[PDB]
Enzyme design. Structure first.
Site, short mmCIF file in Angstrom:
data_model
loop_
_atom_site.label_atom_id
_atom_site.label_comp_id
_atom_site.label_asym_id
_atom_site.label_seq_id
_atom_site.Cartn_x
_atom_site.Cartn_y
_atom_site.Cartn_z
N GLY A 92 98.28 49.26 31.85
CA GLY A 92 98.98 48.24 32.61
C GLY A 92 99.18 46.96 31.83
O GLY A 92 99.45 45.90 32.42
N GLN A 93 99.05 47.03 30.51
CA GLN A 93 99.24 45.86 29.67
C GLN A 93 100.70 45.45 29.65
O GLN A 93 101.61 46.24 29.95
N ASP A 94 100.94 44.18 29.31
CA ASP A 94 102.30 43.67 29.24
C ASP A 94 103.12 44.42 28.19
O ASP A 94 104.28 44.77 28.43
#
Ligand SMILES: Nc1nc2c(ncn2[C@@H]2O[C@H](COP(=O)(O)OP(=O)(O)OP(=O)(O)O)[C@@H](O)[C@H]2O)c(=O)[nH]1
Ligand SMILES: [Mg+2]
Lengths: 180, 18, 415, 177
Positions: A69-71
């Site tokens: 779910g990282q940018d």
């Protein structure tokens, strides 16, 4: 043509199915995948890349592709959407600030024409602290009832406990498999 | 037999050197 | 300090390349071919090329040029050694050196190249070790490479312990056209094909002049080799301390020692050549060969190459012993002899015409060389004393070795 | 051709994936720009086959500078492979990590480099020294920040004499530069 070989293969179990792993970082995606595949909560570092694994249950080998779910990894879910039969969303009921971001990401992902035949699979992660919401408050906040033409089921699972994984797997199998 | 000199047995060391 | 080593082809197409440092762009290989063409056309062609600030050292292989581009002033000798090791590994793995095998085993070739060296530093150099870790038809790396003993793989089991030695003798004689021999050097070669069980530690012993003098037995025929080079498995410490040749023999054929010293004895074959060439009319080949070797030794497959005229045609040979055949590709007459007993005297009388039109340019005078090879002859007189085969388990070995004498640089200057 | 190759690579058949990888390598070796298919091969990277891992690593190294942006999807695979029990796999991963000319790629590999600095395998130690030397050459400041000089100095005073020689050569190259 003949389908005798296919019938023989399906008599003892031939269907496998597919699955995807989506959700915010630190939302139990890696721990959930480890519990589903192995059965223990194994500590994992940040999901810089992706985790690929296969789970065999009820004679069906449902491959699971963990997605961070990282940018820098949020826009990478489009690549993982190709050749995917299922999708699992990991939410963080204890992260009120990240709840809006997760809802926006889920709305953006569900607004893709390619991701239309995949049924909704939302798992109420972090179901071990009092700050975690229930199976209806989280769905109401995320607007799961407003997903037209989407078969989504709300399931609450605790990363430490692992309860509810069997029920979620059974619900996913029932939604995907339309046989006896 | 073989051209280029037949193979011959070799010793282990100089027996006269102790 | 080569940036990347690549294998090219005769048409300028690179058969395979493997970058090691990435400091040089891969497009520099294209300019290598025009540079080589210009250097060959201008006589400035050298194995170590230079494309601006990047040097592309290339070595002419059997079918392609082994171009190893470099950027900084790295070890040129180290690069050459790495290229030679790669060529040896390719020859061991692939029996043919051509484009057919380059494009046939690329899957294993890439893995072998990756395992060979990294970051410009070669790491793997054992062909047997490479085959035990990289195969064309993977497990953990062998412990022999990690262990000190990398020249003898442990755990080898054989039904019989037989070692095949080869006493290869190279007689090089540089006889000038005046009749005096200038370069007369004999290079020894102690190559043994050890095939036993385990990793026995060879204890070499021979009739060396230095060893005999040290032991006080410097009164018999002892070979005093000017240059003696030990193999990889040979322990240099024992040799430096007391000339103790103690080393673990390799699994297979390998060259343990190679003697190299000047020769002060008379030539094995004395060849007298006569050029009775008329002025564009006829040619005379008064070739007389005298065997200066012992009569008990026979030179098998003797081929004394006599260079005939470039434009000569219609030749007639009047010899006594040995078949003479004129090879148009070779442009010379080779005095082919099946078996040449020592002391044999062969006389030849060539006679052929010449074209009426004179040649536009001269062709030079290449030296005359023979291809004699008489085995079972020890001209140097060096006799092997013993081979210390020691095994921890304990077994009786039956090593074998044969002494072979051949003609090396036995070139005689033309008149 | 390209579409068929992409479809084969996007399949679940191991033999088909191996055939597609071999075809891509032959095209890459024959002089075909296969860098556009690097993102497609990114998904088919985590494979149990050792031969397939080597080909994927070679393609990534050859397609790393061409598509540095698309190379961000290999850090997780490299991290997972950095703990592989097989020494050959660890050595290959170490070699591939240093061969990737990515400014932002070596930053995330600092932890695996520190973990592999104390590798017990002499081949593993040599691979770690080579990777450290490659990182220092690519980023001297990054190497200094990682503090690999102390480990490199103690490497010569260890066993694995070939690994000691590799570390000594790496230290000389660092001091030479
Ligand atoms: N201990 C514990 N952790 C939980 C629980 N529920 C969710 N988590 C979170 O799940 C995370 C597990 O980390 P990972 O194995 O890397 O999986 P992830 O959540 O997808 O994190 P990333 O891989 O970085 O995206 C932990 O960091 C926790 O923050 C729980 O009930 N107990
Ligand atoms: Mg995770």
């Amino acid at each position: 043509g003949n389908i005798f070989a296919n019938l023989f293969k399906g008599l003892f179990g031939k269907k496998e199915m597919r699955i995807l792993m989506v959700g915010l970082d630190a939302a139990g995606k890696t721990t959930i995948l480890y519990k589903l595949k192995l059965g223990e909560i194994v500590t994992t570092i940040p999901t810089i890349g992706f985790n690929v694994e296969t789970v065999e249950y009820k004679n069906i080998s449902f491959t699971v592709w963990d997605v961070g779910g990282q940018d820098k990894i949020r826009p990478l879910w489009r690549h993982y959407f190709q050749n995917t039969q299922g999708l699992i969303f990991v939410v963080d009921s204890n992260d009120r600030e990240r709840v809006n971001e997760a809802r926006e990401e889920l709305m953006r992902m569900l607004a893709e024409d390619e991701l239309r035949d995949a049924v909704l699979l939302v798992f109420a992660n972090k179901q071990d602290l009092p700050n975690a919401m229930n199976a209806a408050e989280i769905t109401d906040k995320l607007g799961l009832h407003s997903l037209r033409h989407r078969n989504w089921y709300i399931q609450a699972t605790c990363a430490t406990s692992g309860d509810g994984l069997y029920e979620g797997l059974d619900w996913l199998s029932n939604q995907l498999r339309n046989q006896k | 037999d073989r051209k280029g000199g037949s193979y011959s047995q070799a010793a282990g060391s100089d027996s006269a050197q102790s | 300090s080569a940036s990347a080593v690549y294998v090219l082809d005769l048409k300028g197409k690179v058969l395979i390349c493997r970058n090691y440092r990435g400091d040089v762009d891969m497009s520099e290989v294209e300019h290598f071919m025009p540079i080589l063409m210009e250097k060959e056309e201008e006589g400035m062609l050298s194995p170590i090329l230079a494309h601006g600030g990047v040097r592309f050292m290339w070595i002419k292989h059997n079918n392609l040029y082994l171009v190893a581009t470099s950027k900084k002033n790295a070890c040129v000798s180290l690069v050459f050694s790495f290229l030679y090791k790669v060529v040896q590994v390719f020859s061991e793995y692939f029996k043919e050196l051509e484009e057919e095998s380059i494009r046939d085993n690329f899957v294993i070739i890439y893995e072998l190249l990756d395992e060979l060296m990294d970051f410009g530093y070669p790491q793997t150099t054992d062909s047997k070790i490479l085959q035990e870790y990289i195969t064309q038809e993977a497990p953990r790396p062998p412990a022999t490479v990690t262990n000190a003993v990398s020249w003898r793989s442990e755990g080898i089991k054989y039904r019989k312990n037989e070692v095949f030695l080869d006493v290869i003798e190279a007689v090089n004689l540089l006889v000038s056209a005046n009749g005096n021999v200038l370069r007369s050097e004999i290079v020894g070669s102690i190559k043994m094909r050890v095939f036993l069980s385990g990793m026995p530690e060879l204890r070499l012993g021979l009739n060396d002049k230095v060893l005999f003098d040290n032991t006080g037995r410097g009164k018999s025929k002892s070979v005093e080799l000017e240059d003696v080079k030990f193999h990889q498995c040979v322990r240099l410490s024992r040799f430096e301390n007391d000339r103790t040749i103690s080393f673990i023999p390799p699994d297979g054929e390998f060259e343990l020692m190679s003697y190299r010293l000047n020769t002060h004895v008379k030539p094995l074959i004395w060849i007298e050549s006569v050029i009775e060439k008329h002025s564009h009319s006829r040619i005379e080949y008064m070739v007389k060969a005298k065997s200066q070797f012992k009569r008990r030794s026979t030179a098998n497959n003797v081929e004394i190459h006599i260079p005939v005229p470039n434009d000569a045609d219609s030749p007639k040979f009047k010899t006594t012993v040995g078949s003479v055949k004129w090879v148009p590709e070779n442009s010379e007459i080779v005095w082919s002899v099946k078996s040449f007993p020592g002391g044999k005297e062969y006389l030849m009388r060539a006679h052929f015409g010449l074209p009426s039109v004179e040649a536009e340019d001269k062709e030079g005078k290449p030296p005359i060389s023979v291809k004699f090879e008489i085995p079972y002859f020890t001209t140097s007189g060096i006799q092997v004393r013993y081979l210390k085969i020691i095994e921890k388990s304990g077994y009786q070995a039956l090593p074998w070795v044969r002494y072979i004498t051949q003609n090396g640089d036995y070139q005689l200057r033309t008149q | 051709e390209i579409f068929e190759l992409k479809a084969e690579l996007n399949s679940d058949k191991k033999e088909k994936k191996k055939e597609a990888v071999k075809k891509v390598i032959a095209s890459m070796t024959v002089g075909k720009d296969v860098s556009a298919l690097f993102p497609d091969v990114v998904n088919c990277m985590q494979t149990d086959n050792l031969e397939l891992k080597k080909l994927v690593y070679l393609y990534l190294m050859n397609y790393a500078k061409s598509q540095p942006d698309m190379a961000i999807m290999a850090v997780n695979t490299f991290v997972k492979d950095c703990e592989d029990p097989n020494p050959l796999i660890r050595a290959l991963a170490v070699r591939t990590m240093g061969c990737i000319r990515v400014d932002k790629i070596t930053e995330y590999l600092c932890e695996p480099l520190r973990k592999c600095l104390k590798d017990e395998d002499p081949y593993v130690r040599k691979t770690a020294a080579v990777c450290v030397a490659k990182l220092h050459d690519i980023n001297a400041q990054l190497v200094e920040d990682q503090g690999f000089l102390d480990t490199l100095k103690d490497l010569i005073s260890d066993s694995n004499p070939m690994v000691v020689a590799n570390a000594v050569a790496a230290l000389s190259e660092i001091a030479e530069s």
